[PDB]
């Protein structure tokens, strides 16, 4: 059974009063440095520092020049040469902005997606490799050191509708993506082709790889849109509108993830994490760094947490986190690197701080 417990220590509301769709703690900050997180919503990116006694200290605010931009996602990285932190943000305009989080100014931008960007993810080993997933049915891999588009994952056997989410595995060898077409697709980036394309992007009109075929595809996990996917080791966690996060794997029970053939037609369900009132799309789940906790907010302000070290997903459920004043949809949550703080962000521009007891 789960033993994790949390106390709500603070909340605030951003004055724009627009929904907050993303929240990310900076996991690159070194041990001892202040815990910082970014929120995104409206045409804004806001940074906060966590201090003792629940204090949430406003650091800086970035307001996009375009008043009609609606940011949907953000992700942290660092400059591999100077160790300086960096933040990537994107949304409805389909433009990626690289922001200097110390000065809160935009450094540069990437255009190319034909529609909105639903998620940004940085590679876990190479801080220059940025993955964007879009309403244009494709994923794109960028090298932000050389400003090149490494690869476009889409086409003949790519997604047939808007891509909602994607995740690199722990070592950054492969990506699982999911979207409106109900499918979950695997894209290996440790192939000889992709490793060479990444190397060529460092040597650099650069020619992008056009990856038309995924290494695995399934529409047999969910019966509707798949709006969130994360790797859990070699297994996958994904959700649709069934009020459940499904833990599954490509192939049969004993099939090795690295021996799965691209035409593999089987999938194996290992378990389900059940919850309530979260059957509308655009609701993300998150995990802590060590992947010992899983968190998901619902449409009425409840925050569910599960202990991933408890095998049975029913016994894994922690006490649901609720506050009588937190009644709006929790779009995304983020744990600090050490798992001591869990922040939730809402449709009513509110931010909620929960400290682990």
């Amino acid at each position: 059974k789960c033993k994790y417990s949390f106390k709500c220590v603070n909340s605030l509301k951003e004055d724009h009063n627009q929904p907050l769709f993303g929240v990310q703690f900076n996991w690159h900050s070194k041990e001892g440095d202040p815990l910082v997180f970014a929120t995104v919503g409206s045409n804004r990116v806001t940074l906060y520092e966590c201090h003792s006694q629940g204090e949430i200290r406003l650091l800086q605010s970035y307001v996009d020049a375009d008043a009609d931009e609606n940011f949907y996602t953000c992700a942290w990285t660092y400059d591999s040469n100077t160790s300086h932190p960096l933040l990537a943000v994107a949304g409805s305009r389909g433009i990626i902005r690289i922001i200097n989080p110390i000065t809160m100014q935009c450094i540069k931008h990437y255009v190319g997606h034909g529609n909105a960007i639903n998620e940004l993810k940085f590679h876990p080993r190479d801080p220059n490799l940025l993955l964007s997933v879009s309403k244009d049915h494709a994923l794109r891999l960028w090298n932000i050191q050389t400003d090149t588009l490494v690869a476009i994952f889409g086409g003949v056997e790519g997604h047939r509708d808007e891509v909602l989410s994607a995740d690199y595995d722990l070592l950054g060898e492969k990506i699982m993506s999911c979207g409106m077409d109900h499918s979950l697709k695997l894209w290996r980036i440790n192939s000889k082709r992709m490793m060479n394309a990444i190397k060529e992007s460092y040597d650099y009109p650069f020619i992008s790889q056009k990856i038309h075929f995924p290494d695995f595809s399934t529409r047999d996990i969910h019966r509707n849109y798949v709006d969130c996917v994360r790797w859990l080791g070699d297994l996958i966690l994904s959700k649709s509108c069934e009020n459940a996060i499904v833990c599954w794997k490509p192939g049969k029970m004993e099939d090795d993830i690295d021996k799965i053939k691209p035409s593999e037609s089987n999938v194996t369900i290992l378990g389900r994490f059940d919850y309530s009132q979260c059957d509308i799309w655009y609701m993300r789940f998150s995990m802590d760094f060590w992947q010992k906790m899983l968190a998901l907010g619902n449409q009425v302000g409840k925050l569910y947490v599960w202990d991933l070290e408890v095998e049975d997903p029913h016994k894994a459920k922690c006490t649901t986190l609720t506050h009588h004043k937190c009644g709006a949809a929790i779009r995304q949550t983020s744990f600090s690197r050490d798992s001591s703080i869990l922040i939730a962000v809402c449709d009513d521009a509110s931010i909620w701080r929960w400290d682990r007891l």
Binding site: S29, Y78, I102, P124, E311
Partner: peptide, 29 residues
């Protein structure tokens, strides 16, 4: 088990990332 084997892969792989992070000194925002 499938669970214990998967947890061990997560433990080993997150430990590799944690050691890479420990070796870094990213400037505070």
């Amino acid at each position: 088990s499938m669970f214990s084997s998967n947890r061990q892969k997560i433990l080993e792989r997150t430990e590799i990332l944690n050691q890479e992070w420990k070796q870094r000194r990213i400037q505070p925002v």
